[PDB]
Amino acid sequence: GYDRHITIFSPEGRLYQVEYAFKATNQTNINSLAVRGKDCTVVISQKKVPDKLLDPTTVSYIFCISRTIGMVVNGPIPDARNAALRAKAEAAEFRYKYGYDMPCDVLAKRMANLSQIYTQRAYMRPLGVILTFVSVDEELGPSIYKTDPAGYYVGYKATATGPKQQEITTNLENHFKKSKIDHINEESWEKVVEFAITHMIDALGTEFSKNDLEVGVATKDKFFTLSAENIEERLVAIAEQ
Amino acid sequence: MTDRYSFSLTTFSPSGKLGQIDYALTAVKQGVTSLGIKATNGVVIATEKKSSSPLAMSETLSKVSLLTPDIGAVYSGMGPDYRVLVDKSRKVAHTSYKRIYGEYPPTKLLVSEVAKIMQEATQSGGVRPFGVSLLIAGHDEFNGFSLYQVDPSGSYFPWKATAIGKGSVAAKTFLEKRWNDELELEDAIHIALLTLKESVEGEFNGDTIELAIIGDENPDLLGYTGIPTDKGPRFRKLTSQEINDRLEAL
Amino acid sequence: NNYDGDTVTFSPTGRLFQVEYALEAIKQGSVTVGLRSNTHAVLVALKRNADELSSYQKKIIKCDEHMGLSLAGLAPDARVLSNYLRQQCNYSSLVFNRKLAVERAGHLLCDKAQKNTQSYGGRPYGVGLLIIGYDKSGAHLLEFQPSGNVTELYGTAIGARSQGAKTYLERTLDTFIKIDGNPDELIKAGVEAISQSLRDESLTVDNLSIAIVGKDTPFTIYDGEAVAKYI
Amino acid sequence: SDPSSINGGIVVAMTGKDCVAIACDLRLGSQSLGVSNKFEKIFHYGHVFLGITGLATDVTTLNEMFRYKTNLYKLKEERAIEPETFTQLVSSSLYERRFGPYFVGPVVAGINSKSGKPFIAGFDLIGCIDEAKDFIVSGTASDQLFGMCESLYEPNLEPEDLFETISQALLNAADRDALSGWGAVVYIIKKDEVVKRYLKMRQD
Amino acid sequence: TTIAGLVFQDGVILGADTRATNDSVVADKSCEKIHFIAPKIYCCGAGVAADAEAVTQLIGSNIELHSLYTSREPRVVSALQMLKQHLFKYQGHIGAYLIVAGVDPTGSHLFSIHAHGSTDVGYYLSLGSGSLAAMAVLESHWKQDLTKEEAIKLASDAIQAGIWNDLGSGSNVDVCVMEIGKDAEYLRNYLTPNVREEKQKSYKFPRGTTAVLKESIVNICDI
Amino acid sequence: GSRRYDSRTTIFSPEGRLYQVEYALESISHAGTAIGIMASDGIVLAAERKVTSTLLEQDTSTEKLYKLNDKIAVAVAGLTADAEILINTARIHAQNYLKTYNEDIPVEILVRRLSDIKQGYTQHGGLRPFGVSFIYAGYDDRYGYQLYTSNPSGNYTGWKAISVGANTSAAQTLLQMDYKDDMKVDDAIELALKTLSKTTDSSALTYDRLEFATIRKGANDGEVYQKIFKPQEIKDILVKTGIT
Amino acid sequence: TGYDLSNSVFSPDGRNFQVEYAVKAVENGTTSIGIKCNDGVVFAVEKLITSKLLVPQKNVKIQVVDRHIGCVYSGLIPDGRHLVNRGREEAASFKKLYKTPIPIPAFADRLGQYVQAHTLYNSVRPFGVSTIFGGVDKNGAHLYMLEPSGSYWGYKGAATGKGRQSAKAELEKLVDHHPEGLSAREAVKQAAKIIYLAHEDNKEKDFELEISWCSLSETNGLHKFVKGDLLQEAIDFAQKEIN
Amino acid sequence: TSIMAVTFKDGVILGADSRTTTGAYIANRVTDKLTRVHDKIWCCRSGSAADTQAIADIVQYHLELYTSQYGTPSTETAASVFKELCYENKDNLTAGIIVAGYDDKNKGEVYTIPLGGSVHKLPYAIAGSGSTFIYGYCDKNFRENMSKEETVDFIKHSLSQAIKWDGSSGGVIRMVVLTAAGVERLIFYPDEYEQL
């Protein structure tokens, strides 16, 4: 049974190493969520600092890839950082060669094509990570594009990733079935973040403090992460209505 | 930090089977149904946009791809393998042909180049075969319209009409009854939509079906005027609206 | 068991069996002793013969005018590592007009041996080395294991039955460290130490091999009738 | 010293009504010394004709090369190559040697088998295409040929008139060049017949 | 050669003559110096003719593949960057001097590229042996917010100045108009001020005038 | 490391056989039968297609019979994709010989070159061999008409009549029974089709199933012509010989 | 089964068993710690005295990178040296191009990517060391700890090796009892104590304490070893606390 | 070419002419020789236009990738990247670059990189063909910690003389102001500066 050790086909037509890379994705036990506003894209993620010795400022699964692109990862941090560094390099090289900023979806495709190569070539293992790329693209507008270990990628109106993704997905599905639009009809990003946090609270059935969340926001011409105090201001606003 | 897999991962078993190719064909079987039908004045290729989530934007996932202005491709099996094959197919059309002869390759030769790439994955060191079957529809000045199937093995066969993937056995029987050598392009599109309805469970509309044609030259889609010889791409992907129009007359 | 096929594989308890097996080749090797004072450093080596017709396998190799080693285990591997040491000692001389530090020589051997333990295809070195030298910070003695571990010591022994010599030196520590400006007495202490590892056989004239380096003493090897004095 | 004018020789090609003509002299020399009076400069690959002037070793080498390439083209495409496609192949092949070029002046002539359209083209040594309607000149007496062609030529000549015009263009040009002459060949090309004529000319 | 490009209200326009010369002689009277790169991106080429043709074709091929990969309209800055990076690599040994213009989702753009890889941004530019004749006209008449009709006039005038006054330039005028929100229109032989005058005599010879030694049929067919 | 997963394609069995060659030959034994018959005035190549579907576009299709140059053709049994790699190499070797010597490549030289390539894959490189057997039909001015076969081992031999692929045992018995040395092309055509007609696993032999080709020195004025038969022309020759 | 025989193979869990086996080698090694203080960091390590024949203060385990970063590690000692040698190459090429000395988070990733690369292929073995490292840069003090997996985080206090649980508990007390922070000289003393307390797990053999420190005020931001009177003051403090 | 960068109280100002010549022909009379490698790190380019562009593009790429990994780079870091390229490829380059940038920590900094690929940190720097004519003037008139209005005048008067005497310099005087307040572009036309 060496068809389960490397990236070759089993008799069923399955790549067991890809399937087991997907199971490594949830090893962190962290749930992420991404949604789109009018002018923005918000990504939130659970932040769990189990050790008191950890410096909580260094515990992050959100990465600033370029000025315009942000990337949240579901999976172990070494692979997350492997994928982050490569994406940064690709986003810089793109700008140099072609004279404009790498679009979100193009980066997602590029990283996916890399992930494909690990499923076909035996010496490379897949990365055990799901990469959720976010930007406000100058041509497409607010954009969510997600890559996985299989090399699959697709755009999203909103998305959720992790152990309890199905609960978050169905919560988001139901909201967009009501509103009948592809996005959160909201002017300020501040309120889109409040939505994201609120609908994760409802889906997971847990309350959050400022140090239980991690937030990334894409606007036109910059992506940035929120500090603990920025998140606190968000949580206060949620509680007050 | 070495690639030590310089030996074939696909080998002959005692019975004479190449296991990895057969298993790649099994993966193609599990894949969503796609089909191709050749008419007198065109070719049509079609497939179901099997959406992994309703939150996903299935428009962004193009199962049907332009390879050259006059050649299009669709698949069944593993989507990521297909995507990279499309990238290589587009490039090989330029490097091994257009930059030499100053014109796009004919259908059969581009197919030959794709077939070669897939064959090499079946024999080269440290790689598994591609887990897709491709259907490539195209036109060129001296061969006219044509439809080809390309398997994980690197083998390719020209078809009048065929189907691959999930419900291909039932779909091919359906195409045998309906196909003739006097079909117009619209008739083939109609038959394509009928055949594809049988293998689809859920919704059946322009948003869940991807469908393209190789037909007449489209000078409106060219983008420029002033060269009489360049008359525009024969490949055209049908819109969500254009599919739903034909579904009323179904 | 299942995890000993190559050097690249950890066992479930965190062990590298190929390295431990290379370590075993040292234990099968013939005994050799290293010890030093503040002025001089001495190697004493019991050379091994194949039979009565054969020569006794040479255990001591010179690296520079101020440094050298004795070996226990695979002699071809000692040749490789010694040759590497010679070149590093030589590089230091030519480029920097500087004699190579014994501590730094140990660091270079450690890192050379390490590369063989982390990569596929290669094997660990199957030899242990006792490096002596006199540099700008006085006398030094190093013990090299092919796991990569290099250890600066007052004295030690490696090879078969080396524990007898090593216990002796552990007792004698306070005596032999003070043997300053007296090469012969320091050699005596090494010859008495290696005698604790002998069984059945005793130290003959073509059996024994001694080397010394010190303050105004280049690294020189003594064999044959030059070591009859110390039997 | 100048490679294009060691060996000498000329090629001219003209269009007519439903026909093309291509012609060449027969001289191969080592500067002043005449060596061969049978060195033909016009070859053909199916129905496409290629004249080549310049350094004679490259003339031979490129003929062998385009035979090779067009043979493989035909085995893969399952049809003979056309003049327009071949022109591009010539250009491609010359420019890939951009910085160590073949010292030649090629001239393509032929009739497209599907459209029936007469076609001529010329190139510089690194592959730039001159796709003329009227005529193409090449070789050591190219100035002379330009002067003859530009006055003598008129469009839509019948095959047997075009023969006279291209012949007289060649002959009178070659007689004003030391390194051209020694005989001359003229191909008259129609959609499905080709006539080849050797010309009588002064042998100095 | 005489090439020019300039901008107008909602677009950019390119112009070029049609004369290619070897040494002192006229090899081509109707060559296209406006090169396709993408449907709405074009390139005027002066300098070494093969180098200018070949460089644009290569970038045009790579632009097409890039467009397919990214599913976006190509940008003029992409062409500009790819051209200059290629030309710089070869240290002017690819002697191509280009004016690149086009329309994309960013807007309309106009750039010049020199053989060594330097690039310029301008509202009106000219290159080739007739650039000084052309620039004289552009400097005397160019203004902001030109209409398309004024722009074509000025572009064709700038090229004409080269055609008449420069020996390197001649024959006809090619123009390409790239306007925002519209298909680019390529206008080969936009002006034809140098048609040859009718000849005094017809030099068609009496048949049999040429002496012939041999005749034969050539077998061009297969088998 | 990687060693764990290496099939070791290029080794001997205890018996002194090459596993992968033997298993590739087993693969080829399931492929559609190809027959080559050499006569005094030409060669015949006949071959059975494997995938009967009514929807297969037969007139533009080529799975069995390929052209190597104007003088030499091959019939294929095994993996088509593998064969097409080798074919493009053989086409190049022909043209390299033509460029060098200014003469068409002799048949045995081209065959040896390909067979040597196949041999290389069995002795070194650790890759699987080519699952292809060829029947080479050709002509040159030294030996005239020649039939050869090569198999995945890279061994090649010359033949008067030969079969590869399926039911070669039954096919070679029937050829050995009816072949004669003074035979002519028209007779060989008939023999080839009769042999396939008896050995076929199909219920009947039809035109849509066959690829057919002849090399004749019966072109205009003593040249050699390769004829790859069109579907209608195979249908005609099936009626002429009396099979349908 | 067989998923633990090769590096870079995912088990059905989604685990790389070879990396987890490298952790067992780290757990087997001697105790090492790191303490982040007000304007710097303090590193300490347990060095088991196997024999009287070991020369005191000579077999130095803590290694400097550039001039401003310290590195200590537990596990296979040679693997730790190979990683520091790499770190030095990384820190050199950074300074060569960018002039400024490598920042500590930047340096942390250069190791983190390198260690992670040794979990991607079956042709290499994972690192058999947890590495505690850090120093002072332009943004202030930083302490990191890096595992065989390539996983690393910033720390207030870090510990690894055989006495890690003991050490971690002691570090957790310091964090709770000093929220405003710990001074550099305080951290040196506490480090000595924590290594002494963590020595109950390696209690058979006696040991030798080794401490180093970067501190903006005490060392000008440079990495220096704690030597002489300051080392003896820390040993005395530690000896007093165990009794 | 006439280019200069001058540190003052609130940060730094870069100044340049706009003339590019091919021999005696002015190929471009409205050139932008002030070029952005980062938000608040710019450079002035002199020498081969092809070379200085190719360099500035590579530096921009490096600093963009630096920013993705390590946050905002110092003006010193940028000058070192410029140097590294210029020095290591000195045999194949004709580039004279003045790097100027604003940190909040360091404030305004100017680094000049002449033909050799050496680096010199200076209070102000002048470069290009036209600079030779204003060494006398700039030395006599420069002061440290000037206001923004004084620094603009100093640059304006300086490049005015440089343009007057040097044929290779001319056109408009472009300037770029770098302070905590942000990035400001200024332009000064012939009719303004010629009458000074």
Ligand SMILES: *[C@@H](CS(C)(=O)=O)[C@H](Cc1ccc(CN)cc1)NC(=O)[C@H](CC(C)C)NC(=O)[C@H](CC(C)C)NC(=O)c1cnccn1
């Ligand atoms: C005008 C350029 S100029 C004199 O610097 O203003 C023109 C530009 C041009 C012409 C044709 C095309 C068609 N693709 C594009 C651009 N260039 C020429 O006329 C050049 C001028 C030479 C470089 C001085 N001519 C050539 O390149 C010709 C080939 C032409 C006739 C196709 N080749 C040569 O002059 C030549 C000379 N020695 C060796 C090789 N080639």
Ligand SMILES: [Cl-]
């Ligand atoms: Cl890619």
Ligand SMILES: [Mg+2]
């Ligand atoms: Mg003459």
Ligand SMILES: [Mg+2]
């Ligand atoms: Mg003569």
